[PDB]
Amino acid sequence: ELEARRPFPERMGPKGNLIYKLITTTDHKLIGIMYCVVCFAFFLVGGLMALFMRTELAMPGLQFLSNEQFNQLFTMHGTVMLLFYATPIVFGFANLVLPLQIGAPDVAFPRLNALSFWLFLFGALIAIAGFITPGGAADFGWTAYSPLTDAIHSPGAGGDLWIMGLAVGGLGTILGGVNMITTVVCMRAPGMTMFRMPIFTWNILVTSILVLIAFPILTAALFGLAADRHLGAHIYDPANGGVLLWQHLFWFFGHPEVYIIALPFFGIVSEIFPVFSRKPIFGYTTLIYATLAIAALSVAVWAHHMYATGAVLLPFFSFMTFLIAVPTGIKFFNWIGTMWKGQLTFETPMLFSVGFLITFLLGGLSGVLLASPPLDFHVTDSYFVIAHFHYVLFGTIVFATYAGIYFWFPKMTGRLLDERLGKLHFWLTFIGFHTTFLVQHWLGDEGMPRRYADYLPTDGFTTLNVISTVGAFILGVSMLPFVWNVFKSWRYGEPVTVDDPWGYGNSLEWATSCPPPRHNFTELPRIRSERPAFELHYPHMVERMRAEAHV
Amino acid sequence: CMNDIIALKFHISLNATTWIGRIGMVVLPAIVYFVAYRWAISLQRSDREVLEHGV
Amino acid sequence: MHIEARLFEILTAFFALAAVVYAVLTAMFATGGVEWAGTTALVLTTGLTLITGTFFRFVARRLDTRPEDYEDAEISDGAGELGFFAPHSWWPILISLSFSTAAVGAALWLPWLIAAGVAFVITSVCGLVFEYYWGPEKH
Amino acid sequence: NRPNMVSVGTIVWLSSELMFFAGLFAMYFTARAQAGGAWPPEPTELNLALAVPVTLVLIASSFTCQMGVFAAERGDVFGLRRWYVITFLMGLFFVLGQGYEYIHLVEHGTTIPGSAYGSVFYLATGFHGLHVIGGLVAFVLLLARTKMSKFTPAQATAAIVVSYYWHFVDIVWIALFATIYFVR
Amino acid sequence: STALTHGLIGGVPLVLFAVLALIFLTRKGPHPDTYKMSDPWTHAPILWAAEEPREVVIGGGASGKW
Amino acid sequence: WSDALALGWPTGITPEAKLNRELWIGSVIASFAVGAIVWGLIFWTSAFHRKKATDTELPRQFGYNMPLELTLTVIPFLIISVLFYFTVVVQERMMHKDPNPEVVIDVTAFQWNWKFGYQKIAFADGSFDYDGADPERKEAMTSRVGPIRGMTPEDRTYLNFDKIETLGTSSEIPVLVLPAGKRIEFVLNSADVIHGFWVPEFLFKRDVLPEPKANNSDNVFQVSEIQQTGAFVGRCTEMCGTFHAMMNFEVRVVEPNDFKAYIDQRNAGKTNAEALAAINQPPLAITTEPFESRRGELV
Amino acid sequence: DLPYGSALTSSGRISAVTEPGELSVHYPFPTMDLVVLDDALKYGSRAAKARFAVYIGPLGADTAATAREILANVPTPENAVLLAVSPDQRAIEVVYGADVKGRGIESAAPLGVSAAAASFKEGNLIDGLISAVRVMSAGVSPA
Ligand code: HEA
Ligand code: HEA
Ligand SMILES: CCCCCCCCCCCCCCCC(=O)O[C@H](COC(=O)CCCCCCC[C@@H](C)CCCCCCCCC)COP(=O)(O)O[C@H]1[C@H](O)[C@H](O)[C@@H](O)[C@@H](O)[C@@H]1O
Ligand SMILES: CCCCCCCCCCCCCCCC(=O)OC[C@H](C)OC(=O)CCCCCCCC[C@@H](C)CCCCCCCC
Ligand SMILES: CCCCCCCCCCCCCC(=O)O[C@H](COC(=O)CCCCCCCCCCC)COP(=O)(O)O
Ligand SMILES: CCCCCCCCCCCCC
Ligand SMILES: CCCCCCCCCCCCC
Ligand SMILES: CCCCCCCCCCCCC
Ligand SMILES: CCCCCCCCCCCCC
Ligand SMILES: CCCCCCCCCCCCC
Ligand SMILES: [Ca+2]
Ligand SMILES: [Cu+2]
Ligand SMILES: [Cu+2]
Numbered sequence A: 001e002l003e004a005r006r007p008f009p010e011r012m013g014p015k016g017n018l019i020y021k022l023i024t025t026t027d028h029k030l031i032g033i034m035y036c037v038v039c040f041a042f043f044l045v046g047g048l049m050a051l052f053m054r055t056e057l058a059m060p061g062l063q064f065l066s067n068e069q070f071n072q073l074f075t076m077h078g079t080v081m082l083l084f085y086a087t088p089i090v091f092g093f094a095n096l097v098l099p100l101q102i103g104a105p106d107v108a109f110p111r112l113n114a115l116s117f118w119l120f121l122f123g124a125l126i127a128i129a130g131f132i133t134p135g136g137a138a139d140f141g142w143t144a145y146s147p148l149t150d151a152i153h154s155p156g157a158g159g160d161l162w163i164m165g166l167a168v169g170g171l172g173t174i175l176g177g178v179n180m181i182t183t184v185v186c187m188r189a190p191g192m193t194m195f196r197m198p199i200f201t202w203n204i205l206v207t208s209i210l211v212l213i214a215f216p217i218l219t220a221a222l223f224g225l226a227a228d229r230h231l232g233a234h235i236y237d238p239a240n241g242g243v244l245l246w247q248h249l250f251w252f253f254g255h256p257e258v259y260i261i262a263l264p265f266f267g268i269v270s271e272i273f274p275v276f277s278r279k280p281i282f283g284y285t286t287l288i289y290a291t292l293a294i295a296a297l298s299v300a301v302w303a304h305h306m307y308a309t310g311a312v313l314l315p316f317f318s319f320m321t322f323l324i325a326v327p328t329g330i331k332f333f334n335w336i337g338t339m340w341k342g343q344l345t346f347e348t349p350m351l352f353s354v355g356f357l358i359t360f361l362l363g364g365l366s367g368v369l370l371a372s373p374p375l376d377f378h379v380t381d382s383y384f385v386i387a388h389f390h391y392v393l394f395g396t397i398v399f400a401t402y403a404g405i406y407f408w409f410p411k412m413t414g415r416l417l418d419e420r421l422g423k424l425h426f427w428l429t430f431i432g433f434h435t436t437f438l439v440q441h442w443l444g445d446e447g448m449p450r451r452y453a454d455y456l457p458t459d460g461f462t463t464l465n466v467i468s469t470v471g472a473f474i475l476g477v478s479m480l481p482f483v484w485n486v487f488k489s490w491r492y493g494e495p496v497t498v499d500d501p502w503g504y505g506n507s508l509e510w511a512t513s514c515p516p517p518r519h520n521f522t523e524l525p526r527i528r529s530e531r532p533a534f535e536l537h538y539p540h541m542v543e544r545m546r547a548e549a550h551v
Numbered sequence B: 001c002m003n004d005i006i007a008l009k010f011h012i013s014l015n016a017t018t019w020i021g022r023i024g025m026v027v028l029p030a031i032v033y034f035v036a037y038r039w040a041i042s043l044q045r046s047d048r049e050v051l052e053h054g055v
Numbered sequence C: 001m002h003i004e005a006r007l008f009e010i011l012t013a014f015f016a017l018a019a020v021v022y023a024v025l026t027a028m029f030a031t032g033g034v035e036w037a038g039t040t041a042l043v044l045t046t047g048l049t050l051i052t053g054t055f056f057r058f059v060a061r062r063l064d065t066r067p068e069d070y071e072d073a074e075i076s077d078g079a080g081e082l083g084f085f086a087p088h089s090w091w092p093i094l095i096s097l098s099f100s101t102a103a104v105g106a107a108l109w110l111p112w113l114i115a116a117g118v119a120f121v122i123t124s125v126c127g128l129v130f131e132y133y134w135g136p137e138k139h
Numbered sequence D: 001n002r003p004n005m006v007s008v009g010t011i012v013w014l015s016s017e018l019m020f021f022a023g024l025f026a027m028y029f030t031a032r033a034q035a036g037g038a039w040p041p042e043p044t045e046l047n048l049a050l051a052v053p054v055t056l057v058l059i060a061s062s063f064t065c066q067m068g069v070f071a072a073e074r075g076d077v078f079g080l081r082r083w084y085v086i087t088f089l090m091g092l093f094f095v096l097g098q099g100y101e102y103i104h105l106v107e108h109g110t111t112i113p114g115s116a117y118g119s120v121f122y123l124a125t126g127f128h129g130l131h132v133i134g135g136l137v138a139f140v141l142l143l144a145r146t147k148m149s150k151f152t153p154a155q156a157t158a159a160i161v162v163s164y165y166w167h168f169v170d171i172v173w174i175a176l177f178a179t180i181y182f183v184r
Numbered sequence E: 001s002t003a004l005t006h007g008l009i010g011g012v013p014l015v016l017f018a019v020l021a022l023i024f025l026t027r028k029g030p031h032p033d034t035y036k037m038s039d040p041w042t043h044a045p046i047l048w049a050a051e052e053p054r055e056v057v058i059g060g061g062a063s064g065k066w
Numbered sequence F: 001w002s003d004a005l006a007l008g009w010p011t012g013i014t015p016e017a018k019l020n021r022e023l024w025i026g027s028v029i030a031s032f033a034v035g036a037i038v039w040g041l042i043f044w045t046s047a048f049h050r051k052k053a054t055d056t057e058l059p060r061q062f063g064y065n066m067p068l069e070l071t072l073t074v075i076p077f078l079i080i081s082v083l084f085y086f087t088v089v090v091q092e093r094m095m096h097k098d099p100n101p102e103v104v105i106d107v108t109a110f111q112w113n114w115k116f117g118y119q120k121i122a123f124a125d126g127s128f129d130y131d132g133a134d135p136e137r138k139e140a141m142t143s144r145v146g147p148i149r150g151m152t153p154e155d156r157t158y159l160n161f162d163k164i165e166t167l168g169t170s171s172e173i174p175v176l177v178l179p180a181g182k183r184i185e186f187v188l189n190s191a192d193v194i195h196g197f198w199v200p201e202f203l204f205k206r207d208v209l210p211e212p213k214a215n216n217s218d219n220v221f222q223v224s225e226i227q228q229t230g231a232f233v234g235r236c237t238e239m240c241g242t243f244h245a246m247m248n249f250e251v252r253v254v255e256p257n258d259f260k261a262y263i264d265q266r267n268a269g270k271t272n273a274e275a276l277a278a279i280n281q282p283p284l285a286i287t288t289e290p291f292e293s294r295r296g297e298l299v
Numbered sequence G: 001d002l003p004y005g006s007a008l009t010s011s012g013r014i015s016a017v018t019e020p021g022e023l024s025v026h027y028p029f030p031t032m033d034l035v036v037l038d039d040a041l042k043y044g045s046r047a048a049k050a051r052f053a054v055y056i057g058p059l060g061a062d063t064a065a066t067a068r069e070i071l072a073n074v075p076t077p078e079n080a081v082l083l084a085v086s087p088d089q090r091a092i093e094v095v096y097g098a099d100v101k102g103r104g105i106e107s108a109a110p111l112g113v114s115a116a117a118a119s120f121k122e123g124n125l126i127d128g129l130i131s132a133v134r135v136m137s138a139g140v141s142p143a
């Protein structure tokens, strides 16, 4: 029984194996791969923006940055790192495994799926292109409040390019969300019922609905904003009532948008915990209800970002915001229950997911504090917020993103990332993030507002800013091990000759080869539960799972 | 040659346009040569796929 | 596809309840009367789920149990041609470039560039639509 | 049977489009609440002698569009072309009718920078007019595809989903027409 | 001061990188140890063949022994 | 210890601030208790449920505990309900406005500094009455048809002006003088964009909006009293432009007799700097100093 | 008969799994050395238009006859060259197909054995195979 095999898998394709594929591909796997590379390019670009800001806020006074440059820095940093990195990578992972999870050969609209990538890429470049302008890029913040974003207060072309760049990228997001809903409804494999899909597929379908509610209203608001700057309209005139009008629409977009970049990464860890715990996902039916409740509740809580304005019904939004804490808390108890009485080995995909649980909770606790208007009356527009949202956005779009990458890299490569290099990256990232964002809780409470280019030496913010500056550079140097691991393990990584390199995979992508073929499936097993791959690979456990399912 | 009008219409510094063309006078031809060489060879592979697998 | 429509109806009920409650809760308690920008979005948020939910209801009542909608369905039940899926196309990148050209013209307020972008978008969209329908050349 | 993938995608996207008009409606309603008693204020004077006949033409375009759908499902490509050409002509009349009303309103002092009412009125109706123009482009593109190949069920599906967009556009105008010309 | 502030920002990340790297990068990876001639061949038989050119009578051969 | 559980919150100088800080400490205690339980559960399973290197069979495959799921759903609902009640109680006290205040302050924010005016002073004991309303300069902004309800966007009639005003300068931090132990009313009106009136010792802030009445914004908030004297810094908190970070102000609290005297020099034509020196107070702000005009050290 | 976690699919393919943190290949040679050997095998066969094969393992009692049966597993046996090395038996056997005959392989077959043997006394197995492939591929004409 001798089979002929190469000593090593081919490192790279021959000349001309990719360039024509990149611009003509309709395969979701290649499109999903192009997302991650571009998303990480914007991650590195946006991360450098924060480093300039962080190194300027190290010592009191403007050493190398002006007020205008600093104002442009956080606006572009936030815009790039929420809309150009976080939102696309939601569909970056969705183009990767969602057709595999539901047993589909492709997405519903292969052409429209490819259009979303290029539309997003050219939309993101337009907004960033404001830096090359002499006036500079947008300097009014990613919330672009009115009438600051007005032609009178923002006359440069950088703000105009920021508005139109978001509109082009927003159109791609809407098309991507349309594709995902159609793919889930119509492209499901036989035997794959609605309540049999993986949690990640459930989260993406739910997230895509939130896209259709939020992004079109943002496109409408931006178009009205462009009319004011170019046609001299009175859409957002303060005397007309547009100061509240713009904020209401923008936050009706914004809070659904943060859950657009939260629920899919809740799904990502929900696929990793069962695999490395050798246990089924706890509360699988409950997790779906929690996700639906989170999606529904996220639409009518938009005004808790507007507590300091004194123009919203505080009791309504405070109570509704508190309601979101219940389904989110249920997710932790299900994730903890998944690891309970299991067999944890703590690999790199598992290690990052564990860091998510520790990191996310502290940011979640800060969210409940801000949800109450009396407590928000003092910490709003201060570094307590910045500490809260860099604990909740770094717990998911980074920890869960890295966990999913380490989880699905062998699936889409046939090669395994280095575990020793992965452990170094995780610990460096954890230590750096905690060092740079734990002290900012005290800074905001001490009386330091957000969006401040300079502070006086007598303010007493110097010591904590230096500590935060040290940790941020640790985050910067933590990128080198991960980039090196991806660069080396892609071509010289450990080959994967098995369908499931992690052994106890549950979703359908682990029932196919690594990498999957062009149509993702040369065979399909019988689907009788939410873990078809586990049932196929371990037939002797079919009886045990049914009998021991209920405690 | 049209940098000054491009600078005025597209809101770009005139010094930037001169130096973009100056650096791009050697960098861009090198980039285009690499892309075109791979693109031309990539097209040949696309034709080989139809020959051995059909339309 | 009973479950698919039930998901949107569940969202429809909550969105309708929130829109009605919040409108009636701002008309008598918010300063200035009804919150309009804010209420209008909630009312039409229900319409987004109402349109999709109603269509899914009508579709479900027409077609019988699908192989993917069957609790205990066999893999061989779904054998056959699924449909048409585009193998490759360079049109989508041209559409994005065409749309980005108009956006840059709109951002800088260049009427000539906006007109070129609109013409480019129509030309690029025409290629995408007609890509798999152009007949052989008649010479 | 089988769920129509193209119809599902179009309907799902059409629902998202409704949220785009939600922003436009919010601007009009927010400005209306701040009018103080004059809505529309002087010198704006809306007339129903022109809006009503133009609105009725757009409503009648839905009936002709639906007639083409029946021909499309029946396999009669020529019947589909006849009804969609008529729908295109009456849909074009809506744009010309709206454009004619714009000229008179501008000449009477109602412009986008002139008044806050002019801003909410023009962007709300103008963006809908852009949707009508986009729908007219869809009619031409679909009609051009009918002469390229034989009438296939996939070709008939494209005719149905185009009518879905036209029906959505007509429904949106009815909301805009009632909100602007009646709820003053 | 200004010297201490710049030293911590540029020194601690480099110091932490070196300490953390020595902990993990010095560990033994999952790759098996290199086979030695003295040790017996306990591994399964290995058949290696190239994929080129792209797709039984024996013409002869040669023998050897070391 | 209240100094460590406040996480850096100032002690406060008003009764509303003291009540707000009490809610903050209790909420932090509740949050830490919940966080410790979840962290303990995560750490317990990460150290005692690790794959033992002698356990052959896979672990029990259980993923549904209906009695447990309901219990861990009601408990979070009870905690937020308890917090919501205290949240409603505190916010009602903080936003309460007395119909008969004794000091009214007109706060005007612009790009990029502050202007403070004394609209009306009427002490509760009747020892000091003053009327700072100046209607001969508020109606000079009338501008009229108009794009918005008959008026141009440059109407500016919503702005309030007073006879005695403290104008901020790029080289002089504006100082607001308030009596100790007296109720203060703050009226916030912006000029071009949104700003932020935040005093960290107040433990409360509200965004300064242009045309607050047309935006349905309650731009008026009051404090019951100021419990101690001294100087307290104030910063702009809502992003407003280039110099958002360089438009700070200072609030000076003095005795009621000193406050009454200070108004007399201001009425006598004395500027803010010299009037403060007349009541044995520093002429300039001590908590904050004007920022350097040099765009940086490389200029 | 299938290993733990391995299953037989409907189409006959084998869906195998490996424990997390483990390898699916685990060849007892460095990764870089394997890459060099693949380059020698891939490029050497390309310049010779004859598939080159490398076998490591037992060869039974008679090494010459065992390699003949092993070459049958190599794709396109008629145009394949197999190099068999038995570390335990300390013997080298080279066998080629009928199409390889008359192409200049008879002068390179002892060349590869001697070159591989010389590096085999130094404790280098992968290096010996790499050296054997290079000299054997350099003495074979295309087609
Ligand atoms: C996904 C969301 C996301 C992510 C991942 C991050 C990442 C980081 N952010 Fe950011 N941030 C936001 C979202 C995010 N941010 C948002 C929404 C805002 C508000 C915007 C606004 O105020 O309007 C904000 C604003 C914001 C603030 C407060 C703004 C203010 O001062 O008012 C700060 C504090 O310094 C901060 C710092 C950091 C740091 C140190 C990181 C670290 O993660 C970054 C370190 C990462 C690196 C990658 C370092 C770079 C490494 C390199 C090697 C660079 C080399 C690159 C090239 C050569 C191309 N960001
Ligand atoms: C992933 C992104 C993300 C997520 C998940 C969240 C989650 C939450 N956020 Fe936040 N938020 C942002 C991203 C996010 N946020 C951003 C980017 C901003 C500001 C951006 C800007 O302004 O520029 C922001 C700002 C923001 C504000 C506005 C504050 C201000 O501007 O002044 C508020 C107000 O309530 C808020 C609250 C919450 C709450 C209550 C949750 C809850 O969902 C969290 C609930 C989670 C838990 C509660 C943990 C699990 C529960 C348990 C373990 C049980 C414990 C039970 C109790 C404590 C009762 N966040
Ligand atoms: C035709 C395209 C070919 C491009 C190919 C690639 C080649 C590009 C090389 C990059 C060159 C950039 C270096 C310019 C270096 C330089 O001289 O410029 C500086 C200003 O920075 C900058 O330029 C930074 C911007 C960099 C531009 C990046 C290039 C991307 C563009 C080219 C892509 C085009 C989009 C695609 C087109 C689509 C068509 C189809 C493809 C300062 O000058 P100034 O402006 O005087 O500012 C004064 C201070 O200096 C002084 O201190 C003081 O502060 C003041 O005096 C200040 O005024
Ligand atoms: C290869 C060129 C890549 C871009 C070169 C410049 C890319 C340069 C990136 C590294 C250096 C950045 C380090 C930080 C520099 C800084 O602190 O500012 C000082 C400077 C004085 O202020 C600036 O504003 C700098 C320019 C900002 C970057 C414009 C990004 C343009 C976006 C797209 C338009 C790019 C299109 C690429 C098109 C690529 C070519 C396609 C043919
Ligand atoms: C511009 C049309 C005016 C007529 C109004 C009535 C509508 C019917 C149009 C029928 C067109 C038939 C063309 C055809 O089948 O040829 C097809 C090819 O022509 C095209 O592709 C024309 C595309 C036009 C794109 C521009 C659209 C602009 C829309 C503006 C809306 C305001 C078939 O060619 P073939 O038979 O394969 O040789
Ligand atoms: C990995 C966790 C890092 C946490 C850093 C906290 C540092 C706090 C220092 C406080 C110093 C006050 C003077
Ligand atoms: C959710 C509350 C988080 C609180 C973090 C506090 C970090 C400690 C800062 C110490 C600073 C001492 C001056
Ligand atoms: C006192 C005014 C009551 C208004 C009831 C709510 C009206 C909502 C209008 C939404 C229209 C969306 C098209
Ligand atoms: C006080 C008047 C409130 C008017 C609300 C406007 C609702 C208009 C809805 C029209 C929908 C027609 C389909
Ligand atoms: C007088 C200074 C007291 C500092 C107390 C710091 C407390 C830090 C708590 C951190 C909690 C993290 C969950
Ligand atoms: Ca500094
Ligand atoms: Cu929020
Ligand atoms: Cu300000």
Ligand SMILES: [Cu+2]
Pocket: F194, F195, F196, F236, F237, F238, F239, F240, F241, F243, F244, F245
């Ligand atoms: Cu400010």
Ligand SMILES: [Mg+2]
Pocket: A305, A308, A380, A381, F238
């Ligand atoms: Mg704010």
